[PDB]
Symmetry: C2
């Protein structure tokens, strides 16, 4: 049975990793901001796509590049290590407001030089009115502005950043190389007829693509020249040869399709890198790297032995650390939903493949080498996701638990047993459905053939809507009544609990329509102003259609928003149903006063405990509450069926919505703006994250949790059902308990058709000593919600929310 070595790192990688983790307050880079402003100003006469393509080519040619830390995979995102570039086309509002207050922000600090401070005040004024965000607010209705003002609906990630949230078609890049893609664009332009309106627009986008494809080849050649320059001055023979090998690799993949594993991996990273230079969208993913890079691995390692397996791990480590170098700056408020400065760069391994139309297990030696390399490095990037299926061997599943015991949150699991059948049901072609991948956190899509944001659209706070449904449509936090209704607890005029559910149904249908109206504005402002030239080029079928992903270029296009406060909604309605209506133990007006009073006073404080412990809670396998949550959630799911997403009918298959709960760390900020709820939660405290049970309310062990989670309408929540789980390391020291988990996994995915599970393995004492002496735990990694983060890079608000999570035993 494969036993992985999960401790050894080369001295090169150790020093490289150590250099990155000790950058506690990374700098900010303005190079991209300058060069984009320069080209936007010089090319106002060009169409926006061409203008943006010329902006990227100017930046790539003029920006600072370097090769550092004796790296074997080259390509820097910004002028300084771990620097965040600035992207002014999306917004400058928070930049101008916060530019002097970026050092001391809890959990999101950045160092800004005075010259960068000087440059930003010269650039940002020109972008006012032209940014994506300013244009969104030039079109929002006042009602929509007010909704976004209260925070009951939020879409800040969409208005201040590029979409990304996808994987490009790496097989296409590897098969054709950069010259082959330029040839593809030329053959497509030869079929342009300039007296046909669509072709006139199409040709300008194809021109943009060619400008960017040429620039990327020139940029790879620029690094090749840099490697040769450094090789001539590098005295160490070992490093000199590597630099020359790097220069030769770059020369090859600048034009021709890769021939070796090292070349193919470097090319794939170049794409991953430049995607995050042209756009600051996060969750840029590699999709099934263990599949499309395996032919090179097999040849170089197994057949010809030009490389040793250990060399491949070193190369993977090199790539992983470059992924950790990628950084992104967010506003002070939006950073609280993104605790740990994450970029969610996902890598998918495992799963199945089709051979002559028939499915087989896809796990291969490269799958093992990738899993092992992540176990040795124990970093936040990549966000490793494993595709489970019934045919996966115990050996590989055992190797996965071995890495879970390394205590950095990975690998996480997706489930072919639900993803493949439902994707096919939706209209994903069979060959594509079997080749799906994980994107960002838990969301899934067909890599290289899918539009942006399989999840990651607008956020609805279910708890605040529920409070409004319980109180005449009034939002407790803001006081505004967006949808008036007559029934309210303070009035005591609910005659049934059925009437409470009609109130919820009618309120959530209103906020659902508003959320979609808001997304239509934001998506269209992204469509018209911030085309992704390189990203669109590498997603089927934008080249042939001659338009961007956001215009309908992708073969598939389904998206989902995020519903926040899942456990709180169910627990709250169940407490109401049981204690107020079924038992007559709590009065409607009595409850409203405790909620408005935030359970203040001894009298109200024991009423609160009756709500906490006197009514069943989500996560204990009790149907009286679990099925109620599903019933309330189902109304949102059904309402989504009345709408299409903006790309509907414009090329892509689907063009519709579904649900999702991969709400990252939005539970803490959303809860901070949520008043007391009837589930016993006090005002301003975090909500349950993702779809996990509320912390400290699941008392019947892990098996009871998956019984509850499995009862959600998982098939309609293809944005993902996020299930966290925290264990003490001692709960997996014995093979007895490791096997106990592996059977728990197979049962969750095969019996209950679960979507995903991720594991924290860490003692409560360790996380408290990480608060005490940070310099001690600089490399301590922790699973937040869909991704991993360094515990000492978290703010205390998120540190404690993780510490408060339920610790389970097997």
């Amino acid at each position: 049975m494969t036993t992985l070595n999960l401790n050894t790192l080369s001295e090169r990688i150790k020093a490289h990793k150590m250099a990155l983790v000790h950058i506690v307050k990374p700098p900010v880079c303005t190079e991209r901001a300058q060069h984009y402003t320069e080209m936007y100003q010089q090319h106002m006469d060009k169409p926006i796509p061409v203008r943006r393509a010329l902006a990227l080519a100017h930046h790539l040619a003029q920006r600072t590049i370097w090769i550092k830390h004796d790296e074997l995979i080259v390509g820097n995102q910004a002028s300084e290590v771990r620097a965040a570039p600035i992207f002014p086309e999306y917004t400058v509002s928070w930049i101008e407001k916060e530019i002097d207050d970026l050092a001391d922000r809890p959990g999101a600090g950045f160092a800004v030089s005075e010259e960068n401070k000087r440059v930003l005040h010269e650039i940002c004024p020109w972008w006012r009115g032209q940014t994506v965000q300013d244009r969104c607010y030039g079109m929002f209705t006042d009602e929509q502005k007010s909704l976004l003002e209260t925070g009951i609906i939020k879409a800040e990630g969409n208005m201040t950043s590029g979409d990304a949230h996808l994987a490009v078609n790496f097989p296409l890049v590897l098969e054709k190389g950069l010259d082959g893609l330029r040839a593809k664009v030329a053959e497509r332009r030869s079929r342009i007829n300039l007296t046909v309106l669509d072709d006139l627009h199409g040709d300008q986008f194809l021109k943009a693509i060619d400008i960017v494809l040429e620039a990327v080849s020139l940029h790879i050649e620029r690094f090749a020249a840099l490697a040769r320059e450094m090789a001539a001055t590098e005295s160490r023979v070992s490093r000199r040869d590597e630099l020359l090998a790097i220069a030769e690799n770059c020369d090859a993949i600048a034009h021709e399709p890769p021939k070796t594993f090292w070349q193919a991996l470097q090319l794939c990273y170049f794409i991953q890198l430049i995607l995050q230079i042209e756009s600051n969208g996060h969750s840029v993913s590699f999709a099934r790297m263990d599949q499309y890079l395996y032919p090179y691995y097999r040849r170089d390692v197994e057949l010809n032995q030009s490389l040793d397996r250990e060399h491949v791990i070193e190369l993977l480590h090199s790539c992983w650390l470059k992924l950790l170098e990628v950084n992104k700056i967010r506003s002070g408020s939006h950073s609280k939903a993104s605790a740990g400065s994450p970029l969610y760069q996902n890598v998918t391994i495992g799963g199945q493949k089709l051979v002559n139309g028939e499915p087989m297990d896809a796990v291969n030696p490269l799958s093992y080498a990738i899993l092992e390399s992540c176990g040795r490095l124990r970093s936040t990037q990549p966000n490793l996701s494993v595709r489970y299926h019934a045919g996966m061997s115990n050996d590989f599943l055992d190797a996965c638990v071995q890495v879970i015991r390394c205590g950095f949150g990975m690998p996480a699991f997706n489930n072919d047993e639900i993803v493949i059948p439902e994707f096919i049901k939706l209209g994903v072609e069979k060959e594509d459905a079997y080749d799906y991948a994980a994107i960002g956190c838990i969301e899934t899509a067909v890599g290289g053939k899918w539009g942006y944001r399989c999840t990651g659209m607008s956020f609805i706070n279910f708890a605040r809507v529920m409070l409004a449904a319980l109180e005449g449509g009034r939002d407790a936090t803001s006081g505004k009544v967006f949808l008036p209704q007559e029934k309210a607890l303070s009035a005591g005029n609910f005659g049934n609990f059925d009437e409470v559910m009609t109130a919820w149904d009618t309120q959530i249908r209103y906020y659902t329509r508003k959320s979609i109206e808001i997304e239509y504005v934001v998506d269209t402002m992204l469509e018209e102003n911030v085309h992704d030239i390189l990203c669109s080029a590498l997603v089927d079928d934008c080249i042939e259609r001659a338009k961007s992903i956001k215009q309908g270029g992708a073969k598939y296009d389904w998206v989902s928003g995020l519903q926040v406060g899942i456990a709180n909604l169910g627990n709250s309605l169940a407490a109401v149903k049981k204690l107020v209506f079924e038992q007559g133990v709590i009065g409607q007006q009595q409850l409203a006063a405790a909620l408005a009073d935030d359970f203040d006073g001894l009298t109200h404080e024991q009423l609160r405990q009756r709500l906490i412990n006197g009514a069943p809670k989500y996560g204990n396998d009790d149907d009286s509450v679990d099925m109620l949550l599903t019933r309330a959630y189902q109304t949102y799911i059904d309402e989504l069926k009345q709408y299409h997403n903006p790309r509907y009918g414009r090329g892509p298959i689907g063009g519709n919505y579904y649900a999702g709960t991969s709400s990252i760390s939005a539970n803490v900020p959303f809860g901070a703006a949520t008043m007391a709820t009837p589930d016993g939660r006090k005002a301003h405290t975090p909500l349950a994250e993702g779809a996990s049970p509320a912390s400290g309310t699941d008392h019947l062990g892990p098996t009871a949790v998956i019984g509850s989670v499995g009862k959600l309408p998982t098939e309609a929540i293809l944005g993902g059902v996020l299930l966290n789980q925290k264990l003490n390391p001692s709960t997996l020291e014995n093979d007895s308990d490791r096997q106990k988990l592996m059977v728990l996994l197979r049962t969750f995915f095969e019996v209950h058709k679960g979507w995903h599970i991720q594991y924290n393995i860490v003692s409560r004492e360790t996380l408290l000593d990480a608060k005490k002496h940070p310099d001690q735990y600089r490399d301590l990694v922790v699973r937040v919600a869909g991704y991993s983060a360094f515990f000492t890079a978290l703010s205390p608000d998120a540190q404690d929310d993780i510490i408060a999570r339920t610790e389970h035993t097997l």
Copy 2:
């Protein structure tokens, strides 16, 4: 019969006309440019259609208004009298080049105060890169830039101005009033679904429309207040009460549908005026005024006798002079094609109407009063067109000849006998075809239901293309060979004349495709950057479709370019066919050397003189040349059928092209860039205008001219076949001769199915004395090509082109 009094004018009208005609060097106004820049800068965040609506509302609210000349119809275009406003969104290029050299431009002089030079130096640089023209050149291929640089294809009027070239739905404005229009918009916005993409864009366009309608009403009330303010300072009881009546009528039409003829005329003018404040497009036309204003004329004149018919005449005079106050400034080059600073504001009278689906003569008393009002004033505005039909009475046709004898070039004639059948053939609904009108010059459309520029698209220089077809595809003027070919006169390798025509066919198809490629860029840049909010609002069916005319909002959308050098093409090929090939009296190389040498030297002058008088010319009813010109024109007409215009399939019926010859005064500047031609024309000399015979070549009288013109494929030239005709006034003093003329008209329109005829009536001594003593002939009006102009306001080149035209006798 009916005898009109064509000499009476009130003292009020006399003084007013004198004030306008003695403005020799009109001023420029920067208010619109200043106010549009301010709102463009302060509303960059709004969608472009809404940004333009606020610019207008800000301009109308802040701009300078006044009432002068004791006018009964109020509304000024700019701050000063006959001042031309600046419209920077279309272009600032020619403005920056010619800013100091505007006063002495021949026939296009404007006065620019140092204050205005200072204002435009602040304004223009901000618009660099954002103008329509700059963004056209951000998309043109290098080939398309070179074609335009040489001038063989031209589209200067489209890149530097709005489109206009249409009539809005005046019946809708009169029937609904302004409040009714805002209500029509509200009801349409109530059907907007903000989760449907097309409705999201649509709602922004409807918002813009409503912003503008609100501003129009506020602007009319702004004039009502001014009239009351001036009435307070007015000491003449006569004029004081007139101002009170204006204030009351402005009050009424600011919201409600008008009830009186004065109200209905004032409101129709307010629209006509504001249309030309929001857009500098010209050929803004009234369509069938004698029809949609008759209900008021009948009520006020005939049924109730609230005002005398003579008062109606004075009111029409008031409107006509306000139309003359409108002005427009063009570049130095484009002004040469628009000799006389015209605006082509057309008024259509006559024609037919359907009474329960039965054709009936539409001529009515108001038709006579409009005809008579124009005869007394003898002004360049309105461009009066009469719709001829077989059933029109001898009495009215003689009234038209009475006005033609006033010597200002009007009325011109359109022919129901060809328009209505061919419009129906195109797909125009019978009800609409019978309601067609002339737009601008000679082109025809359905007022209130048609897109822009039924004619007025790109200009192709047929003579230069023909020269290239005779010489290896080389343009003699620039030296460029855009489409190479082997056969050329220099080589003497034409085997026969059929090979000559094959060359013409091959070359003209190439230049046709390229003209449309150029139009597609320009049309698309107009669509995306300069929406006409008020114009679109008042054309069917933009409000219901929630989009502009240029986006496909109009019920009908056909357009046509302009083919220049008609008679030169036929005459040139005729000379070549007869003398070179049929009779072998001139050699191919011999002819080529004469053409390259511009017929220099006594020997070559004899060859030229043989080309002129030794071969038949267009306009003598000689089939040998007439049918050859038709066969050459047929190739362009056939090539047009392979294309659709940019609105095709986006809403409107048709969406295709047809041909046109309404080339205004472009024959002069186009001739200036055309070298010697085989028709005996010397280099740099003017070409023939429109479809008229070349001057001095039609030697067999008028009856023979219409013989030739009628042989053109008129049914395919729905942009108009333009025919000028000049007579000495002594030729129409005998009623014997006047009946000869009317017989010829009925014959030209009914038997030959001709499109149009217009008559200059003036002696050679009058035109030459006006060149010598302009101050003496400031009110001398001459017919140019489709419109009339003040002779003393024409360039010397254009003055001489008219003086050189053939003078016919009957």
